[PDB]
Amino acid sequence: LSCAASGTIFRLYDMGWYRLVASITSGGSTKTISRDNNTVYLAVYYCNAEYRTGIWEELLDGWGQ
Amino acid sequence: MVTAITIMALYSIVCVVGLFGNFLVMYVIVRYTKMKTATNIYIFNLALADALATSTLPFQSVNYLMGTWPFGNILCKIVISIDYYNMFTSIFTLCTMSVDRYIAVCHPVKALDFRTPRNAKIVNVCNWILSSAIGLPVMFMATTKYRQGSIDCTLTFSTWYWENLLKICVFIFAFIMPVLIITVCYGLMILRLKSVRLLSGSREKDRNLRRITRMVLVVVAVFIVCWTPIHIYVIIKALITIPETTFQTVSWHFCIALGYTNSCLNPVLYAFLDENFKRCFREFCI
Numbered sequence: 001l002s003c004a005a006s007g008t009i010f011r012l013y014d015m016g017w018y019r020l021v022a023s024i025t026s027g028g029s030t031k032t033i034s035r036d037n038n039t040v041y042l043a044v045y046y047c048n049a050e051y052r053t054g055i056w057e058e059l060l061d062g063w064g065q
Numbered sequence: 066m067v068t069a070i071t072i073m074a075l076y077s078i079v080c081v082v083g084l085f086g087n088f089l090v091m092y093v094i095v096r097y098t099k100m101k102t103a104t105n106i107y108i109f110n111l112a113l114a115d116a117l118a119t120s121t122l123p124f125q126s127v128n129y130l131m132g133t134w135p136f137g138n139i140l141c142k143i144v145i146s147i148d149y150y151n152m153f154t155s156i157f158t159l160c161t162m163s164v165d166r167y168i169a170v171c172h173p174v175k176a177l178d179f180r181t182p183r184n185a186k187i188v189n190v191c192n193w194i195l196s197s198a199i200g201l202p203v204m205f206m207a208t209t210k211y212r213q214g215s216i217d218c219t220l221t222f223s224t225w226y227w228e229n230l231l232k233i234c235v236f237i238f239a240f241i242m243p244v245l246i247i248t249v250c251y252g253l254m255i256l257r258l259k260s261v262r263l264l265s266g267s268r269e270k271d272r273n274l275r276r277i278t279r280m281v282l283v284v285v286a287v288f289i290v291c292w293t294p295i296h297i298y299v300i301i302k303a304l305i306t307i308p309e310t311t312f313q314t315v316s317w318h319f320c321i322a323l324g325y326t327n328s329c330l331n332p333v334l335y336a337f338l339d340e341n342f343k344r345c346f347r348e349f350c351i
């Protein structure tokens with residue numbers, strides 16, 4: 001069960017699985033999730049990812065189906 | 066003839082727009098309590114210098130139209146000193162703005178202590194005191210020379226040593242060195258911004274910080290683009306003895322006109338690029 005990301009993203013920050021099961025930071029700090037700098041691999045569960053579209057833009061979050 | 070009328074027309078359009086816009090910015094900063102910030106103290110100093118820069122342009126337009134300076138000696142000494150003050154105060158105010166945004170972005174724990182507004186006010190007073198060292202000698206020198214054809218208003222030097230020296234000092238201290246300081250501060254800030262997830266902990270604080278930083282960068286870039294060509298022209302004229310021709314006179318006046326035009330541009334950028342300024346302007350108008 002992976003939570004891949006696509007689209008126009010300047011930088012992808014913290015990725016995670018939410019039922020808060022797991023969090024993987026960009027460095028690799030974890031709170032069993034492995035992330036490759038563009039997908040992470042770890043009741044319905046949902047992909048969550050934080051991102052910034054541009055250098056001057058604001059931090060956003062994108063959920064999944 | 067035709068050139069003098071064109072200059073008068075453009076100068077009057079740059080004079081009314083600039084004076085109105087820079088009066089409005091200062092009024093809004095004074096009137097509303099929320100507006101006061103360290104950056105706003107720096108933006109207020111820039112717009113003071115541009116109001117003083119635009120109030121001179123009618124006398125110059127009349128001088129070009131009539132071929133003679135009829136306004137007297139003292140007004141000649143004030144106008145020329147203001148011409149130099151514009152350049153030095155504006156470049157130093159932009160430099161201090163950039164260092165303030167550097168302290169805010171890269172050293173927040175110690176940024177908090179040094180970004181109080183009173184510090185910005187003292188910084189601005191120090192900026193004017195420093196710029197006087199160049200400004201006051203120019204005021205003391207300027208004179209009305211009674212040429213047989215017509216009165217002229219110019220700078221009297223004691224000539225090669227004393228005149229090339231003034232042009233070199235203006236090229237070095239008031240252009241190159243502040244540009245290097247600004248470029249290094251923005252290179253370091255761009256380094257910090259590209260690799261941080263959050264800059265101030267709170268998401269809103271992060272967005273506000275990045276917005277103000279971008280606005281300051283746009284102002285700096287616009288000023289450099291407006292002022293570089295006259296600066297290069299002064300140097301290339303000093304060393305080459307260009308022949309006199311129509312191209313020379315027209316190009317010379319056009320570069321001076323661009324440098325003056327920049328004085329009215331900033332109030333429009335403040336309104337497009339800042340929510341608080343845009344809101345206050347709308348509330349003021351209506």
Ligand SMILES: C[C@H]1CN(C[C@H](Cc2ccccc2)C(=O)NCC(=O)O)CC[C@@]1(C)c1cccc(O)c1
Nearest residue numbers: 125128144145148218219220232235295296299321
């Ligand atoms: C600032 C730039 C424009 N002024 C124009 C000024 C306006 C004026 C004043 C009174 C009557 C009519 C016109 C002027 O004509 N001043 C005559 C004088 O004092 O010699 C000139 C110097 C200038 C090109 C300059 C640019 C860059 C670097 C630099 O060193 C110098």
